[PDB]
Amino acid sequence: DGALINSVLYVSPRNGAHYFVELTEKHLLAFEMLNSMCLLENYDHVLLFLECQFGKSHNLAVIPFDIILVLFTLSTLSEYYKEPILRANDPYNTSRETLSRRALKLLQKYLAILKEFDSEQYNLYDLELLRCQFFLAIDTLTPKKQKWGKTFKNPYRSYISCLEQRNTILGNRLLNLKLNEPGEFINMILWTLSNSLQESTPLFLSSHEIWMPLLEILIDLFSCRQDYFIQHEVAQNVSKSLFVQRLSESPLAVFFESLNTRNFANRFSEYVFLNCDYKLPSDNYATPVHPVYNGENTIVDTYIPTIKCSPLYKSQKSLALRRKLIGSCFKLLLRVPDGHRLITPRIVADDVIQGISRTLASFNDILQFKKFFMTENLSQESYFIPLLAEGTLSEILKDTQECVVILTLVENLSDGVSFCNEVIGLVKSKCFAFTEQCSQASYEEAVLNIEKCDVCLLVLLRYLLHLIGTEAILDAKEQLEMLHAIEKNDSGRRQWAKALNLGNDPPLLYPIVSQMFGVHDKSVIIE
Amino acid sequence: LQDLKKEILDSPRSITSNTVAKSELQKSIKFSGSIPEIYLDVVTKETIS
Numbered sequence A: 001d002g003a004l005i006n007s008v009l010y011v012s013p014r015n016g017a018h019y020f021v022e023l024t025e026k027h028l029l030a031f032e033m034l035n036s037m038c039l040l041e042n043y044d045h046v047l048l049f050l051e052c053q054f055g056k057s058h059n060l061a062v063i064p065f066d067i068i069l070v071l072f073t074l075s076t077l078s079e080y081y082k083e084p085i086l087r088a089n090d091p092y093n094t095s096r097e098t099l100s101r102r103a104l105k106l107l108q109k110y111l112a113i114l115k116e117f118d119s120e121q122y123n124l125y126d127l128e129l130l131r132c133q134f135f136l137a138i139d140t141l142t143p144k145k146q147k148w149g150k151t152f153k154n155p156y157r158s159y160i161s162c163l164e165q166r167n168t169i170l171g172n173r174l175l176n177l178k179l180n181e182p183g184e185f186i187n188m189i190l191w192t193l194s195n196s197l198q199e200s201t202p203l204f205l206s207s208h209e210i211w212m213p214l215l216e217i218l219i220d221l222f223s224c225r226q227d228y229f230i231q232h233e234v235a236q237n238v239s240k241s242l243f244v245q246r247l248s249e250s251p252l253a254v255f256f257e258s259l260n261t262r263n264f265a266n267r268f269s270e271y272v273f274l275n276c277d278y279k280l281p282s283d284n285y286a287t288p289v290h291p292v293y294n295g296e297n298t299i300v301d302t303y304i305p306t307i308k309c310s311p312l313y314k315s316q317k318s319l320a321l322r323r324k325l326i327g328s329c330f331k332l333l334l335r336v337p338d339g340h341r342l343i344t345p346r347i348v349a350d351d352v353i354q355g356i357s358r359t360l361a362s363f364n365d366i367l368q369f370k371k372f373f374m375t376e377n378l379s380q381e382s383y384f385i386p387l388l389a390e391g392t393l394s395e396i397l398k399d400t401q402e403c404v405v406i407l408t409l410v411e412n413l414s415d416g417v418s419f420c421n422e423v424i425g426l427v428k429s430k431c432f433a434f435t436e437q438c439s440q441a442s443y444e445e446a447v448l449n450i451e452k453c454d455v456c457l458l459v460l461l462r463y464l465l466h467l468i469g470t471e472a473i474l475d476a477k478e479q480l481e482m483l484h485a486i487e488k489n490d491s492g493r494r495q496w497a498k499a500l501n502l503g504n505d506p507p508l509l510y511p512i513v514s515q516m517f518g519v520h521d522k523s524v525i526i527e
Numbered sequence B: 001l002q003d004l005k006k007e008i009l010d011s012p013r014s015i016t017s018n019t020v021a022k023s024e025l026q027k028s029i030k031f032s033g034s035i036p037e038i039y040l041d042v043v044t045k046e047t048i049s
Helices: A024-038 A041-052 A066-074 A079-089 A100-115 A124-140 A177-180 A185-196 A200-231 A242-248 A251-257 A263-274 A311-334 A351-361 A366-373 A383-402 A416-429 A444-466 A475-498 A510-518 B002-010 B019-027 B037-044
Strands: none
Touching: A024 A041, A024 A066, A041 A066, A041 A100, A041 B002, A066 A100, A066 A124, A066 A200, A079 A100, A079 A200, A079 A263, A100 A124, A100 A200, A100 A444, A124 A200, A185 A200, A185 A263, A185 A311, A200 A251, A200 A311, A251 A311, A263 A311, A263 A351, A311 A351, A311 A366, A311 A383, A351 A444, A383 A444, A416 A444, A416 A475, A444 A510, A475 A510, B019 B037
16 A cells, blocks of 8 residues: 555564664664663653654654653653652753653654655655554554453664663553553553543543543554554465464454453444443443553642533544544454454454444434544545444334345445435335334434434445545436435425424435535525 | 830731732632642742743
């Protein structure tokens, strides 16, 4: 794909790592200086060294993997519960920023630099060395075997690492050491996902400021490592049996091995949407969550929380993180050959799709459903979002209507005419239309199901427009008939609206389709 | 001595390092919460940065 996964010109493959890159004299001197400054606990000078030459020169300063781990540990030292320790470490805050914030900003900026390889902006050797350092950090961040609830290796022999003699930065254990525990990585994921929507100020501060960004960085780095593993670690041509074994050893396979539980589908669906609006089905057992670093749930008296975030902002961030986790899971699942299944992780794509569809259909709040199904970039999440939308629509039709119409819209995305014909067939069956069986007492629940079904159809229509564009909306009679059928469905909803059961107008997708590809309600408002 | 004592009684008989600054910061705080005194003390006693 990109230059990030296909640049092996300066690499020196070794038994431990295939991405290993040798250090030059200038890089060796920089590594030694950073390690020496880290040894004296002068983190402020380390951050100044990294920031002073960032973006001001053609050459790139490569952060060593041990320094990357030190920055990851610093990111956990948030001001709200560690203000006295940070003030003691740096009495004169020359930067006027928290050490945790500066470390997180540097990590995010370096991740952004790593994501796109600009050969013109930066020399290829520096980019490859940075990729090697990040991959070494990810390899040191390998999760331990899941628990329901070897110290340090330096590949470079040129310099002595600072982490060899120390396991803690400022009273907090190193992130790699903390995560390399049987019950910590899954615990951390559950803690951040639970605290993402928490109203409590300490819990909200713990995730929003610390765990949410670190988890996003880890997911992106694991995705890049998975791409590198698939591109080079594999043997290319294969008998389709060894490839499954190699995929079982892939970094994403180890990442999701710590979340295998007993049944991956149901437990994973509960974990990703933990503490969401959906009602918990089958009285699932509560999942224990504890703070990772001492008192993450406590706020020091010195710190004063002066920041308020709206519930929509928190929901948007939480659903984006959930989408990233589901996308990583589907990216790992899509590589599995048809028929064969992974040995180490008991993961099935159909089971995950069904579990996510069950969780989405159980949502009682439309806002979270829309946040999950609305994405800024369709191409980035094109591989799993249409499948989830189709599954949710199928389940909604199954519960609302006694007759379950098989949906082939995902394969019909290739041909617009087939998609429009299938939509006409579904609306003719009245499964898409409001169901007369639903009682007036439960009208609000029926409207809640209908709006979610409309959201799923809108997502599928957006993907169809992304795949085919706007070329035969009126030229082909099938699309015009589909728009007429949408108008007929709108008239069916208007029949219940004229029934005057409730003042609120039933949700109509006709304006949204008109904005997207309805050409201004056809002839209704073209004038 | 009695008249001198009467004027002496008029005179007041029988730290505040940052009391005024801390008090003024407390009055203009724009915050509905606890606002612990330790935060005011650490904010008003920097003297270096």
